[PDB]
Each structure stands twice: as C-alpha cells, then as structure tokens.
Amino acid sequence: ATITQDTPINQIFTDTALAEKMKTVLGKTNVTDTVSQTDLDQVTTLQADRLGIKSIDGVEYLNNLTQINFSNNQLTDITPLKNLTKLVDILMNNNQIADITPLANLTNLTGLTLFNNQITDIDPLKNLTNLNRLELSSNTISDISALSGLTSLQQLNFGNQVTDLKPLANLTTLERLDISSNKVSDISVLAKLTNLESLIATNNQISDITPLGILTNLDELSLNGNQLKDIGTLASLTNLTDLDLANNQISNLAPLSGLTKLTELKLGANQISNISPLAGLTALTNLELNENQLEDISPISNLKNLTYLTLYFNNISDISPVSSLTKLQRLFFSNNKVSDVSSLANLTNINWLSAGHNQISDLTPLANLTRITQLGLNDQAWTNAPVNYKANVSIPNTVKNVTGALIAPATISDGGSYTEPDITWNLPSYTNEVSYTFSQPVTIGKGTTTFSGTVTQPLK
Amino acid sequence: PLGSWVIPPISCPENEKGPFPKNLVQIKSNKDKEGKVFYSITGQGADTPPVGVFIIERETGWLKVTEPLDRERIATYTLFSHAVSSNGNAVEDPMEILITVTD
Numbered sequence: 292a293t294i295t296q297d298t299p300i301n302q303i304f305t306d307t308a309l310a311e312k313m314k315t316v317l318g319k320t321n322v323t324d325t326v327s328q329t330d331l332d333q334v335t336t337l338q339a340d341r342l343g344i345k346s347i348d349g350v351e352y353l354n355n356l357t358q359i360n361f362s363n364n365q366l367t368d369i370t371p372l373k374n375l376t377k378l379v380d381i382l383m384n385n386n387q388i389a390d391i392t393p394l395a396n397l398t399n400l401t402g403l404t405l406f407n408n409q410i411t412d413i414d415p416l417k418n419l420t421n422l423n424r425l426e427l428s429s430n431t432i433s434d435i436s437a438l439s440g441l442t443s444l445q446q447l448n449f450g451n452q453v454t455d456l457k458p459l460a461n462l463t464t465l466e467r468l469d470i471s472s473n474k475v476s477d478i479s480v481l482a483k484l485t486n487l488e489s490l491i492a493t494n495n496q497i498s499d500i501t502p503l504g505i506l507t508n509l510d511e512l513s514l515n516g517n518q519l520k521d522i523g524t525l526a527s528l529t530n531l532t533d534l535d536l537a538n539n540q541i542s543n544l545a546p547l548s549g550l551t552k553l554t555e556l557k558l559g560a561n562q563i564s565n566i567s568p569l570a571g572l573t574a575l576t577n578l579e580l581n582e583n584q585l586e587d588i589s590p591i592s593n594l595k596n597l598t599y600l601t602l603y604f605n606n607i608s609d610i611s612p613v614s615s616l617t618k619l620q621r622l623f624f625s626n627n628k629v630s631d632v633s634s635l636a637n638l639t640n641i642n643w644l645s646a647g648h649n650q651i652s653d654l655t656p657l658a659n660l661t662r663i664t665q666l667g668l669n670d671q672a673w674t675n676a677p678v679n680y681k682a683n684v685s686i687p688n689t690v691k692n693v694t695g696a697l698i699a700p701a702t703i704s705d706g707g708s709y710t711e712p713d714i715t716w717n718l719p720s721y722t723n724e725v726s727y728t729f730s731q732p733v734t735i736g737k738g739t740t741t742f743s744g745t746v747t748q749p750l751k
Numbered sequence: 752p753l754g755s756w757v758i759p760p761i762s763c764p765e766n767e768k769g770p771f772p773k774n775l776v777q778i779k780s781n782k783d784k785e786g787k788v789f790y791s792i793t794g795q796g797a798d799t800p801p802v803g804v805f806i807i808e809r810e811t812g813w814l815k816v817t818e819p820l821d822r823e824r825i826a827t828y829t830l831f832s833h834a835v836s837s838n839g840n841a842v843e844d845p846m847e848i849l850i851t852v853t854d
C-alpha cells in the first residue's frame with residue numbers, strides 16, 4: 292500500500308476525524324493539502340485516542356507504524372491494520388470491534404489492548420507469540436484456546452464467559468493475571484503459574500483455593516465475591532501486601548495471622564466473629580470488617596496504623612477499641628448497637644464518620660472533631676429500661692446536640708407533650724409502651740447529617 | 752451528603768503496568784440492603800476530557816483506571832460518584848471524589 296502521486300490527505304483518510312488528525316501529524320495546513328509516500332513513511336507512531344474516529348481507512352499507507360493508540364473511538368472494521376507488520380503496540384480498548392482477523396499476521400506485537408469491545412473469537416491471536424501484554428476483559432470470550440501458545444505473556448486479562456482455564460497451563464511467564472467476572476470455579480491450572488505476583492479473580496464461583504499454595508511470589512490477591520470458606524492455603528503466601536476476600540463465607544482467620552506484610556485487607560460480608568488472628572497485622576492501613584458477626588472487636592486496638600476502617604452491620608456495643616487508632620481518617624460503623632461515643636474524641640485525624648443506625652443519644656463528646664467533612668448520624672434507635680405505668684407518666688428527654696442543648700422531640704406517641712426537659716403523657720388506661728422520635732440536622736466541622744432516631748419506653 | 756456512601760480514599764501511582772483496566776477501590780452505598788444500586792461517575796477524566804481515564808462498573812461499584820497516569824501532565828482528578836435505583840432515582844447525593852496521582 293503506497294501512494295504513487297501527491298494525494299489530498301482527506302482522499303487517503305476518509306474519516307473526517309482521522310483526516311484532521313493526520314493533517315496535524317504530517318505538518319500540513321488544510322485536510323486537502325497533498326502528501327507523498329515519503330511524508331507518510333515518516334509516521335512511526337500515532338496517538339489518535341478519543342477523537343470520535345469511525346474508520347481507519349488510509350492507515351495501511353503508514354507502512355512504518357510501530358505504535359498506535361486508537362482507544363476510545365467508534366471503530367468496528369480494523370482491516371486497514373492487516374499489513375502493518377512493524378506494529379509492536381496497539382491500544383484499542385473501548386471501540387466496537389468484533390472481528391480481529393486483521394491482527395492475525397502482526398507477529399511483532401508485544402502489547403495488544405482490546406478490552407471493552409465486542410470480541411468473541413480470539414483465534415486470530417494464536418500466532419502472536421511475541422505478546423507480553425494482552426488485555427481482553429469486557430468482551431464476550433468463552434474459549435481461550437488461542438492463548439495456549441502465547442508463552443511470553445506477562446500481563447493478561449480476559450472476559451466474560453470463560454469457564455475453562457486449561458489453555459493457561461504453559462504460560463509460566465505470567466506475572467499479573469486478571470480473570471474477574473468469568474464463570475470460573477476451577478483454578479487448578481493457576482498452580483502452574485509460579486511467577487504470578489498479582490492475581491485478580493473477583494466475581495467468580497471459586498470455593499477451592501488450594502491451587503494457590505505454591506504461588507509464593509503473590510503480593511496482591513483479590514478473591515472478592517466468590518464461595519470461599521477454608522482459606523488455610525493463604526498461610527503460604529507470606530509476600531502478600533494487598534488481600535481482598537470480601538463477599539465470601541469465611542469464618543476462620545487463623546491462616547492470615549502470619550501475613551505480616553499486609554497493608555490492605557478486605558474481609559467485609561463474611562461470617563467472622565473472631566478477629567484475634569488479625570492482632571499481629573500491624574502494617575495494616577486499610578481494614579474492612581463490615582457485614583460480619585462481630586461483637587468483641589478488642590484485638591483491633593493493636594492496629595495502630597489504620598487510616599481506613601469499616602465495621603458497619605455487625606453486633607458491636609463497645610466501640611472503644613477503635614479509640615486507640617489515632618491515625619483513623621475514615622470510620623464506618625452504622626448498624627451496630629453503640630451508645631457511648633465519648634472514646635471517639637481521641638480520633639483527632641478523623642475526616643469521615645459514619646455512625647447512623649446505632650443507639651447514639653449525645654453528640655457532645657464529638658464537638659472538637661472540627662476536621663470532619665462527612666458525617667452520618669441518622670436513624671438511631673434504643674429502648675429504655677421499663678418504667679412503671681401511671682396515667683401521668685413522664686420521662687426525661689435524653690437527646691443532646693453537639694452544642695450541649697437538648698433536641699426537642701419531633702413527634703411523641705399517644706398524644707404526649709414536651710416541656711424541656713420532660714416528656715409527659717396523660718394515659719386513660721394501662722398501655723405497654725410509649726415512644727418519641729427526634730430529627731435534627733447538624734453540622735460538625737464541614738460534615739452535615741440529620742441526627743434522628745426513635746426512643747421506645749416500655750411501661751410495666 | 753454522606754448518606755449511606757462507603758468510599759475509601761483514591762490514589763493511583765503514575766506509570767502503572769497492566770493489565771488495564773486496573774481496580775482502584777470499590778465504591779458502595781448501604782442503600783443496597785433495600786434494593787439494587789447502580790453506580791456511575793462524572794467529571795474530568797470520566798465523562799468529560801480526558802474521557803474514560805476512570806470508569807466504574809455499574810453493578811459492582813468497582814472504580815478502575817484504564818491507562819497509565821502521568822503526575823506531571825495531570826496530578827489530580829475530581830470526579831463525582833452517583834447511586835441510583837433500577838427506576839433511575841438517586842439513592843444518594845452525588846459524592847465529590849478526589850483522585851491523587853502519586854510516585
């Protein structure tokens with residue numbers, strides 16, 4: 292493919308967007324300006340991402356291209372790449388490509404980015420044996436047989452219909468693999484990939500992780516959203532620094548106890564009641580423990596370097612172990628049974644404090660936390676100890692704002708009334724309970740929320 | 752504005768190696784206990800130029816970076832996360848999110 296006469300740029304590159312780009316690249320003034328093959332031969336790289344290109348007709352004449360970026364365009368047909376055999380790197384993520392047959396003979400490729408396209412058939416990749424980076428996620432691939440001969444691969448991803456990982460067996464050069472959001476249950480083949488450093492396998496159907504035992508070079512592992520329970524194998528992976536096991540069925544954390552390089556650990560939405568095994572994990576800066584079965588969180592006081600912690604949706608009454616965590620910047624503990632927040636006055640670095648759906652009645656200990664930027668205190672609830680029924684029963688309002696002022700009830704049950712500080716009923720007959728609600732917008736520092744709740748008063 | 756958002760701080764080293772896209776943090780709204788939540792992001796680097804440097808998986812809330820970053824070119828990005836129901840109704844107030852590009 293060679294221009295034999297001076298040709299207007301827009302007669303070579305028929306796409307409007309590509310003609311405009313080429314005009315600039317070739318140092319011309321108008322898209323109608325003429326160029327020769329000697330001009331086109333000088334183009335060895337092209338960064339043409341994000342330009343709304345629909346067609347690369349004309350690229351076949353850029354015979355000396357070695358690196359191209361056509362990512363984030365509207366490409367469908369990629370036929371003009373067929374004979375550009377000097378190409379070593381293609382960025383072509385986020386297009387509408389289905390047919391990759393034009394890539395079949397680009398044997399000098401070392402990098403090929405094709406994620407977020409409409410690819411099913413990857414058979415045209417089978418001879419691209421020089422590839423070391425290949426990205427195929429967010430496509431509709433089910434069969435990865437074409438990958439079996441790609442023995443220089445170091446970085447790989449694919450999706451989203453793969454169940455059979457057998458074609459990976461000989462790709463022992465693999466260092467970084469992402470198999471998230473496929474239909475994978477059987478990861479036995481991964482035991483062959485002893486050079487793996489990073490393995491991302493979120494949103495699959497994995498329950499057996501014994502194949503990972505000998506993958507001791509792993510420093511990063513994500514098994515978020517599978518069917519894990521027995522994590523005994525993880526004790527072997529002493530180089531782990533980042534571990535994501537959220538959205539599983541894990542209860543026994545003992546295998547994690549020696550993983551002392553861990554700086555990030557995600558364990559939310561599991562079946563954990565015992566966190567004593569986490570006690571020695573002092574390099575942790577991020578820990579997620581939400582949606583478990585926690586009550587005694589005392590072992591957490593050891594984790595002095597935490598800056599991010601989640602504890603929401605548990606059975607915690609006593610929050611004071613977190614008060615040791617002086618570096619905390621973001622703390623989430625909604626949906627527990629905490630009433631006394633006075634120990635949190637010690638969290639002088641806190642920015643985000645999420646504590647809705649607890650039993651908090653008094654904001655005063657929080658008054659000096661002026662660096663707060665995000666705050667949640669909505670929908671508290673508690674039940675008072677029973678008091679004796681009597682027709683003129685009265686209880687004090689205990690609900691106190693950060694200013695120290697009582698917050699007047701929003702509503703009071705059974706036609707009851709309020710005169711600071713007392714809520715008083717006038718009951719005609721015995722009733723088993725009375726109640727009140729409160730709802731008060733409040734800001735602490737720059738963090739705004741509605742401090743609200745419902746208070747139940749049983750009557751004996 | 753916090754509402755039921757649960758969001759970790761976001762930082763990405765420059766010159767990261769693939770495979771891309773790379774998971775950064777998983778964003779969540781605790782509104783997901785009462786119905787399906789769908790996530791989206793807006794902002795420079797998301798839906799405006801440079802478009803799609805950052806993306807979010809609408810069902811999982813996985814925020815991802817799609818290409819290497821360069822701190823000297825752009826050192827920070829300001830995005831906004833959105834959380835809606837299956838019926839298009841916001842279940843959270845949009846949350847401004849800072850992305851810091853590190854060493």
Ligand SMILES: [Ca+2]
Nearest residue numbers: 401421422443
């Ligand atoms: Ca190679």
Ligand SMILES: [Ca+2]
Nearest residue numbers: 765821822823
């Ligand atoms: Ca730089």
Ligand SMILES: [Cl-]
Nearest residue numbers: 316336337338
């Ligand atoms: Cl260029």
Ligand SMILES: [Cl-]
Nearest residue numbers: 537538559560
């Ligand atoms: Cl989680």
